[PDB]
Amino acid sequence: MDKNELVQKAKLAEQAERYDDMAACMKSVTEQGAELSNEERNLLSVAYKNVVGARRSSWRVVSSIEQKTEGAEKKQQMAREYREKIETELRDICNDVLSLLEKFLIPNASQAESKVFYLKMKGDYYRYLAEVAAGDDKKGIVDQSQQAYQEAFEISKKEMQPTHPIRLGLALNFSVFYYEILNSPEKACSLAKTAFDEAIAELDTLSEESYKDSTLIMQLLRDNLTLWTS
């Protein structure tokens, strides 16, 4: 199979809700070396989002049964082993994505939009490891998560309008990073209230192809605010 067929094969997998298949498809595309198009970039983001998400889900659930079974010795051993199994899975998935960003996506970003996008993705995927790390290792991968986000946040503010959906997106997550990982609610609220208030201030800059997305992410940001102050 060549590139054009893989994109289409990926687009079907997405329809079929079969994300491991959608995933590997893009994994190929990306490995061929050529810089990804906006459409192609998103198939990959969605593929992996979905692949990773299922396992973070199964993790959260099992992890939370370990707690429940405090006191039930034999039950809890069973959960721990299964947890670790899922955790393993999840870690390959992250490595994959991260290793794909290192060779290909990042060094190839001839454009700011690409750079921000793929750097956010880096920040995101380490974050996912931070949810699940580890002692000793946690410190390091928290930082690698922080600095990807940092670069991305700086390059976004320099090059992009406040109402760009990727800049809004990045804030949303970087915020969550501060909240759940660095355990710093204040900063988290501050960061998200800025991203929101600056976008609300500038509503007339919404290119038609994205006013829905920007808008949505804006609602998400204020939601987090509502919840974190509650």
Binding site: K49, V52, G53, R56, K120, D124, Y128, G169, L172, N173, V176, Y179, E180, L220, D223, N224, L227, W228
Partner: peptide
Amino acid sequence: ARKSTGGK
């Protein structure tokens, strides 16, 4: 629960 790009 909080909302992230990786959300729902």
